[PDB]
Amino acid sequence: ASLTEIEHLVQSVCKSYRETCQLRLEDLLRQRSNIFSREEVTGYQRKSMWEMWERCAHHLTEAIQYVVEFAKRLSGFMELCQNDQIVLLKAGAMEVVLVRMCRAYNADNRTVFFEGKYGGMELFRALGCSELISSIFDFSHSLSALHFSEDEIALYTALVLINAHRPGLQEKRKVEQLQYNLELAFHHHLCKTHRQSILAKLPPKGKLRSLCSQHVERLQIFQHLHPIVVQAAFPPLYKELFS
């Protein structure tokens, strides 16, 4: 509701991002030339489906805990009723992980950081959901073409999370207010830094939603063949958000 207040909001979000980013951009960048060997790829590819799923679910969920800490730190988030917090997190946490992914992604060889090295799509073949992995690496690759800064990742992912159109919200108008101000902080930081050229370059909305649905669909097929794996082996937080 003030210019000075939104300058503070930019600062708030960026700093909150750094405290919850799980890994600093250059710890990712520095590890790019650590690439899984052919023999190490076939090791991953020899794990069962449920075993690759639970290793993947585990790592996703440790990433998601950082995202949850991040959301808690977004203005007004804790002053929303618990229903709506849960709604924003169920709809947004995975979206934020997909954006945070571009940091851990090397566009040069289309690899992602996983268990201490970089691997390609083939690293994930035992998951049995290969159109999805390809979609996710494509998204990540289009995102890298944007060349986001850390500050832009902060402000943008705050905005993916704080969205008043999420279905299931009770207090839609309280979150419109919250989102409006983060829209302002984001637009503000871009015109200050002479980006803003990237507003039309940004993904739809749709797109991320489509990525998320695909992940849930895939998980749901997985659960058909392994019902109690999800209920007993998967982290509870992952189970809670996704099924």
Binding site: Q65, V68, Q82, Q85, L237, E240, L241
Partner: peptide
């Protein structure tokens, strides 16, 4: 146990 989202949200 139940409801880990509730917990993460309540826990300072």
């Amino acid at each position: 146990k139940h409801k880990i989202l509730h917990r993460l949200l309540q826990d300072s």
